Design an enzyme around this catalytic site. Sequence first.
Site, PDB file in Angstrom:
ATOM      1  N   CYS A 120       0.807  -1.210   0.000  1.00  0.00           N
ATOM      2  CA  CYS A 120       0.000   0.000   0.000  1.00  0.00           C
ATOM      3  C   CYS A 120       0.854   1.281   0.000  1.00  0.00           C
ATOM      4  O   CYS A 120       1.648   1.523   0.916  1.00  0.00           O
ATOM      5  CB  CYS A 120      -0.924   0.019   1.217  1.00  0.00           C
ATOM      6  SG  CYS A 120      -1.997   1.489   1.063  1.00  0.00           S
ATOM      7  N   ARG A 123      -0.300   4.604   2.658  1.00  0.00           N
ATOM      8  CA  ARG A 123      -0.172   4.469   4.099  1.00  0.00           C
ATOM      9  C   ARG A 123       0.050   5.743   4.910  1.00  0.00           C
ATOM     10  O   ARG A 123       0.027   5.702   6.137  1.00  0.00           O
ATOM     11  CB  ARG A 123       0.904   3.427   4.428  1.00  0.00           C
ATOM     12  CG  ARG A 123       0.404   1.993   4.285  1.00  0.00           C
ATOM     13  CD  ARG A 123       1.505   0.982   4.566  1.00  0.00           C
ATOM     14  NE  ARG A 123       2.462   0.886   3.467  1.00  0.00           N
ATOM     15  CZ  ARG A 123       3.656   0.309   3.571  1.00  0.00           C
ATOM     16  NH1 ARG A 123       4.040  -0.214   4.724  1.00  0.00           N
ATOM     17  NH2 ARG A 123       4.457   0.239   2.518  1.00  0.00           N
ATOM     18  N   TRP A 292      -9.277   5.478  -1.462  1.00  0.00           N
ATOM     19  CA  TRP A 292      -9.626   6.184  -2.685  1.00  0.00           C
ATOM     20  C   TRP A 292      -8.571   5.808  -3.711  1.00  0.00           C
ATOM     21  O   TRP A 292      -7.460   5.406  -3.356  1.00  0.00           O
ATOM     22  CB  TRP A 292      -9.727   7.710  -2.484  1.00  0.00           C
ATOM     23  CG  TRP A 292      -8.564   8.375  -1.832  1.00  0.00           C
ATOM     24  CD1 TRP A 292      -7.331   8.622  -2.375  1.00  0.00           C
ATOM     25  CD2 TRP A 292      -8.515   8.860  -0.487  1.00  0.00           C
ATOM     26  NE1 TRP A 292      -6.517   9.228  -1.442  1.00  0.00           N
ATOM     27  CE2 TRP A 292      -7.218   9.387  -0.278  1.00  0.00           C
ATOM     28  CE3 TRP A 292      -9.446   8.899   0.562  1.00  0.00           C
ATOM     29  CZ2 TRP A 292      -6.825   9.947   0.948  1.00  0.00           C
ATOM     30  CZ3 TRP A 292      -9.055   9.455   1.776  1.00  0.00           C
ATOM     31  CH2 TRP A 292      -7.756   9.974   1.959  1.00  0.00           C
ATOM     32  N   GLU A 297      -4.115   3.234 -11.226  1.00  0.00           N
ATOM     33  CA  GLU A 297      -4.830   1.982 -11.032  1.00  0.00           C
ATOM     34  C   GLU A 297      -5.886   1.835 -12.126  1.00  0.00           C
ATOM     35  O   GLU A 297      -6.037   0.771 -12.734  1.00  0.00           O
ATOM     36  CB  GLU A 297      -5.520   1.977  -9.668  1.00  0.00           C
ATOM     37  CG  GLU A 297      -4.613   1.672  -8.498  1.00  0.00           C
ATOM     38  CD  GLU A 297      -5.317   1.850  -7.164  1.00  0.00           C
ATOM     39  OE1 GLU A 297      -5.515   3.017  -6.746  1.00  0.00           O
ATOM     40  OE2 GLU A 297      -5.681   0.820  -6.551  1.00  0.00           O
TER      41      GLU A 297
HETATM   42  C1  HEM Z   1      -6.571   6.456   1.297  1.00  0.00           C
HETATM   43  C2  HEM Z   1      -6.230   5.999   0.062  1.00  0.00           C
HETATM   44  C3  HEM Z   1      -5.474   4.868  -0.288  1.00  0.00           C
HETATM   45  C4  HEM Z   1      -4.690   4.825  -1.410  1.00  0.00           C
HETATM   46  C5  HEM Z   1      -4.477   5.928  -2.438  1.00  0.00           C
HETATM   47  C6  HEM Z   1      -4.086   3.511  -1.471  1.00  0.00           C
HETATM   48  C7  HEM Z   1      -3.449   3.085  -2.623  1.00  0.00           C
HETATM   49  C8  HEM Z   1      -3.114   1.762  -2.827  1.00  0.00           C
HETATM   50  C9  HEM Z   1      -2.605   1.272  -4.096  1.00  0.00           C
HETATM   51  C10 HEM Z   1      -2.137   2.069  -5.340  1.00  0.00           C
HETATM   52  C11 HEM Z   1      -2.540  -0.071  -3.942  1.00  0.00           C
HETATM   53  C12 HEM Z   1      -2.191  -1.081  -5.018  1.00  0.00           C
HETATM   54  C13 HEM Z   1      -3.412  -1.420  -5.840  1.00  0.00           C
HETATM   55  C14 HEM Z   1      -3.098  -2.392  -6.954  1.00  0.00           C
HETATM   56  O1  HEM Z   1      -1.953  -2.364  -7.459  1.00  0.00           O
HETATM   57  O2  HEM Z   1      -3.998  -3.172  -7.340  1.00  0.00           O
HETATM   58  C15 HEM Z   1      -2.903  -0.429  -2.585  1.00  0.00           C
HETATM   59  C16 HEM Z   1      -2.811  -1.718  -2.057  1.00  0.00           C
HETATM   60  C17 HEM Z   1      -3.181  -2.064  -0.757  1.00  0.00           C
HETATM   61  N1  HEM Z   1      -3.754  -1.180   0.145  1.00  0.00           N
HETATM   62 FE1  HEM Z   1      -3.903   0.822   0.009  1.00  0.00          FE
HETATM   63  N2  HEM Z   1      -4.470   2.700  -0.387  1.00  0.00           N
HETATM   64  C18 HEM Z   1      -5.362   3.516   0.327  1.00  0.00           C
HETATM   65  C19 HEM Z   1      -6.165   3.056   1.399  1.00  0.00           C
HETATM   66  C20 HEM Z   1      -6.117   1.767   1.958  1.00  0.00           C
HETATM   67  C21 HEM Z   1      -6.850   1.313   3.118  1.00  0.00           C
HETATM   68  C22 HEM Z   1      -7.881   2.105   3.919  1.00  0.00           C
HETATM   69  C23 HEM Z   1      -6.381   0.071   3.443  1.00  0.00           C
HETATM   70  C24 HEM Z   1      -6.696  -0.750   4.540  1.00  0.00           C
HETATM   71  C25 HEM Z   1      -7.469  -0.507   5.635  1.00  0.00           C
HETATM   72  C26 HEM Z   1      -5.401  -0.271   2.442  1.00  0.00           C
HETATM   73  C27 HEM Z   1      -4.775  -1.532   2.319  1.00  0.00           C
HETATM   74  C28 HEM Z   1      -4.055  -1.979   1.224  1.00  0.00           C
HETATM   75  C29 HEM Z   1      -3.605  -3.354   1.018  1.00  0.00           C
HETATM   76  C30 HEM Z   1      -3.548  -4.513   2.017  1.00  0.00           C
HETATM   77  C31 HEM Z   1      -3.110  -3.399  -0.228  1.00  0.00           C
HETATM   78  C32 HEM Z   1      -2.677  -4.618  -1.038  1.00  0.00           C
HETATM   79  C33 HEM Z   1      -3.810  -5.532  -1.473  1.00  0.00           C
HETATM   80  C34 HEM Z   1      -3.352  -6.568  -2.470  1.00  0.00           C
HETATM   81  O3  HEM Z   1      -2.259  -7.133  -2.271  1.00  0.00           O
HETATM   82  O4  HEM Z   1      -4.085  -6.826  -3.448  1.00  0.00           O
HETATM   83  N3  HEM Z   1      -5.230   0.768   1.506  1.00  0.00           N
HETATM   84  N4  HEM Z   1      -3.290   0.718  -1.875  1.00  0.00           N
HETATM   85  N1  LIG Z   2      -8.750  -7.193  -4.479  1.00  0.00           N
HETATM   86  C1  LIG Z   2      -7.445  -7.293  -4.211  1.00  0.00           C
HETATM   87  N2  LIG Z   2      -6.957  -8.195  -3.357  1.00  0.00           N
HETATM   88  S1  LIG Z   2      -6.309  -6.176  -4.948  1.00  0.00           S
HETATM   89  C2  LIG Z   2      -7.156  -4.993  -5.987  1.00  0.00           C
HETATM   90  C3  LIG Z   2      -6.676  -3.729  -5.947  1.00  0.00           C
HETATM   91  C4  LIG Z   2      -7.154  -2.907  -4.723  1.00  0.00           C
HETATM   92  C5  LIG Z   2      -6.295  -2.813  -3.586  1.00  0.00           C
HETATM   93  C6  LIG Z   2      -6.680  -2.066  -2.474  1.00  0.00           C
HETATM   94  C7  LIG Z   2      -7.936  -1.404  -2.454  1.00  0.00           C
HETATM   95  C8  LIG Z   2      -8.367  -0.593  -1.226  1.00  0.00           C
HETATM   96  C9  LIG Z   2      -7.366   0.568  -1.064  1.00  0.00           C
HETATM   97  S2  LIG Z   2      -7.652   2.017  -2.076  1.00  0.00           S
HETATM   98  C10 LIG Z   2      -6.826   1.857  -3.595  1.00  0.00           C
HETATM   99  N3  LIG Z   2      -6.457   0.657  -4.045  1.00  0.00           N
HETATM  100  N4  LIG Z   2      -6.542   2.929  -4.294  1.00  0.00           N
HETATM  101  C11 LIG Z   2      -8.803  -1.480  -3.579  1.00  0.00           C
HETATM  102  C12 LIG Z   2      -8.417  -2.230  -4.710  1.00  0.00           C
END
Ligand code: HEM
Ligand SMILES: N=C(N)SCCc1ccc(CCSC(=N)N)cc1
Lengths: 416, 414
Positions: A120, A123, A292, A297
Amino acid sequence: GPKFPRVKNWELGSITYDTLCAQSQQDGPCTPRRCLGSLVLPRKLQTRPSPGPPPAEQLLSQARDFINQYYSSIKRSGSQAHEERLQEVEAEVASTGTYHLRESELVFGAKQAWRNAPRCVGRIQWGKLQVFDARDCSSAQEMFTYICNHIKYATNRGNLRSAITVFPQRAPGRGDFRIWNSQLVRYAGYRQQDGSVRGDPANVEITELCIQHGWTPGNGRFDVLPLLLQAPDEAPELFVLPPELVLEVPLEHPTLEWFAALGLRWYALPAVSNMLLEIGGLEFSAAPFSGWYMSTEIGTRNLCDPHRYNILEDVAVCMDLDTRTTSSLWKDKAAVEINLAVLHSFQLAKVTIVDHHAATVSFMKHLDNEQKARGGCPADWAWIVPPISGSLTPVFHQEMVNYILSPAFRYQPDPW
Amino acid sequence: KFPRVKNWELGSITYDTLCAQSQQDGPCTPRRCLGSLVLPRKLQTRPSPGPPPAEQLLSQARDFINQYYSSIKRSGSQAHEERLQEVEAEVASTGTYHLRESELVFGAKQAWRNAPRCVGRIQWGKLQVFDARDCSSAQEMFTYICNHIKYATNRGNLRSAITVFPQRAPGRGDFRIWNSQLVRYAGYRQQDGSVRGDPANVEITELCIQHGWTPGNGRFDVLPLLLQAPDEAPELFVLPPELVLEVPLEHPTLEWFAALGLRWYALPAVSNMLLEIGGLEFSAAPFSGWYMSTEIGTRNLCDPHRYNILEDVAVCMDLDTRTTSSLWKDKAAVEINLAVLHSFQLAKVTIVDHHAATVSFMKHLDNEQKARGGCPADWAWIVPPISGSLTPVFHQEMVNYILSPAFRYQPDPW
Ligand code: HEM
Ligand SMILES: N=C(N)SCCc1ccc(CCSC(=N)N)cc1
Ligand code: HEM
Ligand SMILES: N=C(N)SCCc1ccc(CCSC(=N)N)cc1
Ligand SMILES: C[C@H](O)[C@H](O)[C@H]1CNc2nc(N)[nH]c(=O)c2N1
Ligand SMILES: C[C@H](O)[C@H](O)[C@H]1CNc2nc(N)[nH]c(=O)c2N1
Ligand SMILES: [Zn+2]
């Protein structure tokens, strides 16, 4: 010097040592012999269904560690409350085999889980998370109510707010609470006769699953799929999200007037629903969370990946680019405009979004914060660096150390 | 165990069994991954004042000789057996041994093939190997380097080449090329810490000046080489201008781009890395191929700590540099890379764009899967610095490990 990984930023020439990795309790997929850092799903974290109750000894250890983390976060380590709470958990695991988290413990763990997420990039917002406790939820129908409230609160008419809803934890020999869809919002993917796909290829299986379960399919390129919710020991029930609750944004380009005629669009709320939230050994199989979008993405992965909407060629033809030769960089050009279109459309519609530059810069700030607060920050380079303009963002020049810290968000097998 | 490797674009899967042949440890451990790190904490290549353990060396020597005879389908043959006996005889009596030219040629090619950070390894079988082991002076080094440059450049039709100077020897100083590349633009520190030229070459530019070089005052002043023969102070040598082919940069449609006065050299040649074959170490073995456009257009010209021309190009394009969301950086980056490609093609100088380059690497992964059961690759270095996911390698999982023969980093001689 220090006996910890030396981390360097090659742009600024600054050095730091990661001591937080010493806190890792779980091994990743690498070894001195070979690096598997680029693997999406190395078979380690993978929370494979472990039906029969877990070794009380194993759980107790994870639970004590978490409780210690909790009391440390409130600056009361070694206090009477800390020791009593410790006794309370051991007692409870002793008589039931498991235990339950207090309200504030759940809130702390949910945030720590986000905080510990190596993939993420958002963070820096970790401290601001609306935690909806739904550990009282007793039905697939109630799961739907909870989810709808989540979407309403998080969407907040375009001024998105990070949120998470936590459903009942996995129980001894009992069925799990599961959300079959990978995200609360997903566009259907219809397998065609000629073998192609209409809509989003990423969702072909879940689409066929919804149909097998009674959903009457559409034939559009952007049909919102229904949710397959599963309460313990029951087959999943199908629920259709009220259109008014799924905010979408039609995509248009700021100067290329024909882009809007492409009829492209995307949904505002990015919400993962297939991951497992682990805290002190406890496992929450259903705990959808959302923040958001970061423009790449939508604009780069979802719209331009070969195995997704794959709109690159269509957009290049419209820009009248030379798609017969790689050296014209037609792919790079169309990608830039497509991404600009996403940022433009979202801003116009007044829906929260952050570009890859702003996002990575804020993550650099987050790294600084964490270096001071915990002495490091687990980060997956390949996932942190944006899919376009990689070295144009600051994270590209930042070395990163990746490791597993708990609480955490882990992948889990599909319930089917 | 053998790692399952998946390509998320196609759904194809393979199993890397080649990694089992790795005998050298990387930076990772089960507790944490350090794959994004550029340099080893120590994996490097420590001094050579004492002879390397006869056992170890002999072990690496036998392995390499076995590799060689296998390559020429003459394993177990008479020659193979007698060659092994020679090596042992020599190590036992002198504490080291020497390679036969053919073996050296095989080693150089294998090192390139095993280089995890190289995206152009599909060309690994086509490498001109200049044997320069009969070199005894900085002056001779300079003559060898000039011939390598003439050969490799070939008037714009670049040809991959490598020149191998004497192997390291116990208790004796190493032959070394102080410059990191055979062609580097000077970086002059001045006034307010700012830098004129290439910031990456500040230190080397200073060393040259200290050793009598008459510095210039341009952004693209070709530096001189500091060649060092064993235990001797390095010597300064100026490269004949007609030898260092350069490409002036202009844009296919943007008339004003050429006015920026940007240019880059044609020959990318590393000269600071060490080549290890069968335990023997070659501290000075410069190698060159041809540039992939993103190296010049994205990293060299656009890195913030390099020429950092992004803003200038943006203002010239009259872009909105007021905010990140206008994607002015991404827009200028693409035009700058286009210019590089256009310019080199105009000058009839070999160059490959990142799309073509990564497509060829994918075919290579396949060729290797069938040929050796895998292929060590460093995902962070293979994926281009712009348009990552727009190329096939982004969607391809990779396993990284150390095979020998190998190219390795070594300490700066000063
Ligand atoms: C506030 C805005 C946020 C932004 C801009 C952000 C952005 C991102 C992005 C760019 C990714 C990768 C998405 C992808 O490549 O498919 C990601 C992954 C992740 N985010 Fe964040 N995030 C945010 C909020 C959150 C929140 C609220 C949580 C958890 C409570 C979170 C947990 C995670 C996790 C665990 C992953 C990896 C999931 C996976 O491996 O598929 N994110 N986030
Ligand atoms: N479904 C999966 N395991 S990975 C798909 C990608 C994905 C990752 C994290 C979010 C929530 C954080 S907000 C954000 N990603 N900008 C939404 C979508
Ligand atoms: C024929 C054209 C070739 C092309 C297109 C090519 C392309 C590349 C690129 C893009 C990189 C990364 C450069 C950087 O980011 O700094 C690289 C690294 C490397 N290449 Fe190749 N290469 C070619 C030939 C060769 C040759 C002939 C050798 C050696 C015999 C070789 C050895 C290496 C090694 C060892 C690395 C890593 C260098 C380091 O870590 O600093 N390459 N190559
Ligand atoms: N790069 C190519 N396209 S051809 C292969 C030879 C080569 C590899 C890498 C560099 C960059 C500096 S890396 C360093 N000096 N260790 C320069 C030259
Ligand atoms: C194979 C490779 O690991 C894979 O394509 C990764 C690379 N980096 C990524 N980075 C982000 N943010 N999201 C992804 O889905 C990926 N996919
Ligand atoms: C910190 C990070 O490892 C570093 O910036 C790497 C990333 N990928 C790279 N890839 C290539 N080809 N060349 C480089 O110099 C780098 N630098
Ligand atoms: Zn690793």
